[PDB]
Amino acid sequence: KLLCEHQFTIIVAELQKELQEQLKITTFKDLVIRDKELTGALIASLINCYIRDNAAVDGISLHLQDICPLLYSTDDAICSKANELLQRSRQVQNKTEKERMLRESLKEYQKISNQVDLSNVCAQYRQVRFYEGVVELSLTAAEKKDPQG
Amino acid sequence: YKTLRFAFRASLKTAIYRITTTFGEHLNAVQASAEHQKRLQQFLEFKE
Amino acid sequence: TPTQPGSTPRISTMRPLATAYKASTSDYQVISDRQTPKKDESLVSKAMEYMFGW
């Protein structure tokens, strides 16, 4: 319903083509019982429209949290907010505000750190010279893998 | 070509009026010299 | 057996179903144009405006 209302045909055209063709052969009972990549990629495309076309992802993340308690889609929504701030930090030319939005982006990833692609996030920090968040998030991604020592 | 200089004086006054009659009082926000803003007001008030 | 009983006497609430619309529109209620003053497109009148001019 949410994908129909956010103009559908747009969000489906943002997908990888291999998923655009899989979408035509997966039945609703396959999408419910068996699939995860089509459902995750449709959420990811909906949010990449918000990030690219520069809406605030908070105003779709909070809607996905009412309608997608599977396992709770709060962590996809936090990762999406952490990513929104990280990709906007690549366009911010105001240094102190880039250092703000990187320490904000970091404090979203520092919640969900057990489930973060730390290699990709820390490489995406190298791509903005944010070596501070590479030390912090990589410790906060060991901190909670072994909380017992 | 003998009278074309009166056409230049006439078309410069129509050209300045053609900008005061689209932007109107938004032209008070336009950064210019104080005597140019004072001249621009004479082309809003229709004194020219 | 008799027919139906009459109402208690009133003043009628009944309206016309056809509205008295004062614009002659039948020839445009179907998607068309038909007749009015018109544009001089013809070759004969254009030849007249080279030869005579009415």
């Binding site: - | 009278t3 056409a7 129509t14 229709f46 | 004062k22 009015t36 009415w54």
Partner: protein, 383 residues
């Protein structure tokens, strides 16, 4: 639409003061070259009326009035001083036209010339010098009946019923450019569209010609029972209203925009439409019958395009042949509509002699009316 949809005229002693809520609120008060001007003048009785022409300045509360003594007077809301204009060539004034994109320039049509008065807008003296009056004329273009400036301020037109050529003037290089057509009549009245791209030209005959201000092309309309008497463009110029002498009809004609290249063609629809009728009707009033209908002598639209004022003249069977002001509410998109508003009435025993709207009134519209008493009224229409 027709007169058979209008509200009654107000009772035979009330004056219409303004429109508000779409209601008209009332109160108790607020040929030779001479007779060839009288055949085509915008004033319903120009040969006997004290007032020969009225014209607003196209951007400000300044106006010009031509009178039966061939004075032109200038009035302004910020001046108690009234310039009295009279040149040695000024006779039988037929038309007035202020220049757009200027404070300071007025054209006047006379029996033997055009006069372009230059007027010092801060120094409005009671009688300016006869040098402040640039004379324009050409052989055969006499008398001059009508004058029309281009909206962009760089061109002027003039009309003469004797002359099978519209005269375009540049007033600044001082050039004259006849647009000669291959017979039919000469030029009676002239009207630009507001884009400055289209021009209506009427004649003494059952033919009008519309013209293009880009490539100077012509399109021809000869399928009328009488002469085309008057007309008006919509604010976008996409619609042209017109009326014909002997025909009780307001016609409309459309002109779509040039979404396509490579031809100067004026581009009107192949047909007009009929939208409002002015047939010889009755309406019931507290004073008994009134009777209406006749021929539309002048039509003027507001700058907003939401009010059309129509100066009808009755036939000698209807209100003794008096002229009457009808007011329509108008719409220009998506459909074109002529809804009634009502009937505008003046001082008891007056006749309406001329109508025109104000070009820059920041509260709906403002209708100037010139009366047979020699009075001028200004009736606001609030929207």
């Amino acid at each position: 639409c027709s007169l058979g949809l209008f509200p009654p005229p107000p009772p035979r002693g009330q004056v219409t003061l303004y429109e508000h809520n779409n209601e008209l609120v009332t109160g108790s008060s607020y040929l030779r070259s001479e007779d060839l001007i009288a055949e085509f003048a915008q004033v319903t009785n120009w040969s006997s009326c004290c007032l020969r022409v009225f014209a607003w300045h196209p951007h400000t509360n300044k106006f010009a009035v031509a009178l039966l003594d061939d004075s032109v007077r200038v009035y302004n809301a910020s001046s108690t001083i009234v310039p009295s204009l009279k040149h040695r060539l000024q006779r039988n004034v037929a038309s007035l036209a202020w220049k757009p994109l200027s404070a300071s320039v007025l054209a006047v049509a006379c029996q033997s010339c055009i006069l372009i008065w230059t007027l010092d807008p801060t120094s409005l003296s009671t009688r300016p010098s006869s040098g402040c009056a640039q004379v324009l004329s050409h052989p055969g273009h006499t008398p001059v009946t009508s004058l029309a400036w281009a909206p962009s301020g760089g061109r002027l037109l003039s009309a003469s019923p004797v002359d099978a050529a519209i005269r375009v003037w540049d007033v600044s290089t001082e050039t004259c450019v006849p647009l000669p057509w291959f017979r039919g009549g000469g030029v009676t009245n002239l009207l630009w569209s507001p884009d400055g791209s289209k021009i209506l030209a009427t004649t003494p005959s059952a033919v009008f010609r519309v013209w293009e201000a880009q490539m100077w092309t012509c399109e021809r309309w000869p399928t009328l029972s009488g002469r085309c008497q008057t007309g008006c463009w919509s604010p976008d110029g996409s619609r042209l209203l017109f009326t014909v002498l002997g025909e009780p009809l307001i016609y409309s004609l459309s002109f779509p925009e040039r979404c396509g290249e490579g031809k100067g063609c004026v581009g009107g629809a192949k047909s007009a439409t009929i939208v409002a009728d002015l047939s010889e009707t009755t309406i019931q009033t507290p004073d008994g019958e009134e009777r209406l209908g006749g021929e539309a002598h002048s039509m003027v639209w507001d700058p907003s395009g939401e009010r059309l004022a129509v100066l009808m003249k009755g036939k000698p069977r209807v209100q003794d042949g008096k002229p009457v002001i009808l007011l329509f509410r108008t719409r220009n998109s998506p459909v074109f509509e002529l809804l009634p508003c009502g009937i505008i009435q003046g001082e008891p025993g007056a006749q309406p002699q001329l109508i025109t709207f104000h070009p820059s009134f920041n509260k709906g519209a403002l209708l100037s009316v010139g009366w047979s008493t020699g009075r001028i009224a200004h009736i606001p229409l609030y929207f």
